[PDB]
Design a protein around this ligand. Sequence first.
Ligand SMILES: [Cu+2]
Ligand SMILES: [Cu+2]
Ligand SMILES: [O]
Ligand SMILES: [O]
Lengths: 325, 325
Amino acid sequence: ASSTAHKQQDINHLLDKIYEDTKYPDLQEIAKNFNPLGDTSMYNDQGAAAEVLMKELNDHRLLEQHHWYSLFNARQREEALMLFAVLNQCKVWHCFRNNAAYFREQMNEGEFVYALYVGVIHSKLGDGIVLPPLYEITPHMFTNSEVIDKAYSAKMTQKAGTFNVSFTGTKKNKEQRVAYFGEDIGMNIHHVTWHMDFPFWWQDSYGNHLDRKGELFFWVHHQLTARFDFERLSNWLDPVDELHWDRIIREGFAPLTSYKYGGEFPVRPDNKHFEDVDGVAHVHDMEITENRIYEAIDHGYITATDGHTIDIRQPKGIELLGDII
Amino acid sequence: SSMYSPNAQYYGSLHNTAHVMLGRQGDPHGKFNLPPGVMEHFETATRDPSFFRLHKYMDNIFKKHTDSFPPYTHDDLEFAGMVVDGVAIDGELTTFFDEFQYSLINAVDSGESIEDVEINARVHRLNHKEFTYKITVSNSIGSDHLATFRIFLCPIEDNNGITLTLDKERWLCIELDKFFQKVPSGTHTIHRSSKDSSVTVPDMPSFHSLKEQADNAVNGGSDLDLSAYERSCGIPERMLLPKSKPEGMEFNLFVAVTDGVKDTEGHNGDHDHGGTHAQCGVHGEAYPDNRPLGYPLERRIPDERVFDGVPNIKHVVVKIVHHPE
Ligand SMILES: [Cu+2]
Ligand SMILES: [Cu+2]
Ligand SMILES: [O]
Ligand SMILES: [O]
């Protein structure tokens, strides 16, 4: 029941054809009849997390299915983490499986996929499971619009096919020379999995501490940056400049990619100045935040909420900077 | 503008004034007591990168005029009975840098009654190895005919690796040679050495060499064939070819063979035209080629089929390799 074979098959089934109601009769039956609140002894918190999520569901406060999802959207992230919190409290696999099946059919698919992945990664119940590659679970997030269009045409015409992916832009765009780095599907899996392993929303009340996370955050991104610059050097290009909030972003981008639901990803023109983003931040807020971080660095200490100093002139200083940055 | 301008009051002097406008941008209001810029002397103007931005700007003015004419037709271009069967080169196309010395003695102050000393500058300069064109033509008229051989080097791809159409190549082509030669009936191979180019002239003899030769003649009495040196106008022989790359670059070598009788009407074919008539004309004589400068590449070529159908035009791929130190 909780053998590796059954848990793996359950996860495979839950992630199969994620944009449609489940086609597996056993999962259909669970989603119809299981009650996340029916027996709260299955949870290490006696049902607190399930109560939170069920109240949001019953009050019609959750993001609808067939809608874009972004982990950087505060409310959508909070909704995905409500499901993660339920899965994380499950004592045994049948709780994990049944809640996953129940909420798969109620919740936005992007939120669901995210919660199930981090639930598997951060629960002991997920030990031994191999998560399918996200580029086959949500291929729109890893595949350009031209190839997706060819897939839609194959499906409309009921014909199989294999379609070649090319890079975006043209040869006139020198940045295309290094598209094989940031568009590589495995490099993108590396990146999302690092953040799934070391999420910025992690709280140790979820079960365990993530050792040196803030320093690993610095290091993994330093390595992405240094590796990209090595590809630029390999292709007769100069190193990337750094962004600054008061200077133009020289290199624009046309993704030529689309969401499954939500439309095409937006383009950014060349040589644009940063503008304030309504509901996110003013450009000036970013500059102030940057200044405050540099104040801590140049002071040698981070300032606590009550004004006391937290020394960063020690080996953990870089980690604490990762935490606040 | 020149004094040949029909209306300087209205059209002014765009190019010469632009030289001064650019040259003076380091002190445009005369506040700093700065002397004229490098753009304000023909000796120095090409040292400034802005020289080539200014002259591309000017070149595009001329190009709007030359582009306004109807493209050449088959009948325009055909030298009836003259076909270029093949184009090849004897000798690899190899560039390198070598060393050249000239005297600085005139720059330094001497006298009175104090002896001079040898003071030289050594510069590194582009150069290339000798080669000879092999142009096989068939004259299928029953008579020997004067022909003009027009030789251009054209890019195949731009810096982005994009293959250029003939219309996009033609304005980028550089003149390598132009010469008049009688083509006897039948099939014959014309040989032309790189050293004999009508586009180029040799390195100037040194001041010291000119003094030695003149002094040796005056003090004694000897009629030296000074009618040896070319002129000083002309691309230096050493710079006939572009530098190219160590890994090699491929270019299109474009040969057009045109009716020499019509091209030279009024100036004879057997007459001596000097070593630099392509761009520097013939000292004290009319310009010897009646065709528009740049013929036959100086009009739009929207339909490459027209040029491909003309037997007296042919281009072949050649490779130039730079040999670094
Ligand atoms: Cu990241
Ligand atoms: Cu000029
Ligand atoms: O010039
Ligand atoms: O010029």
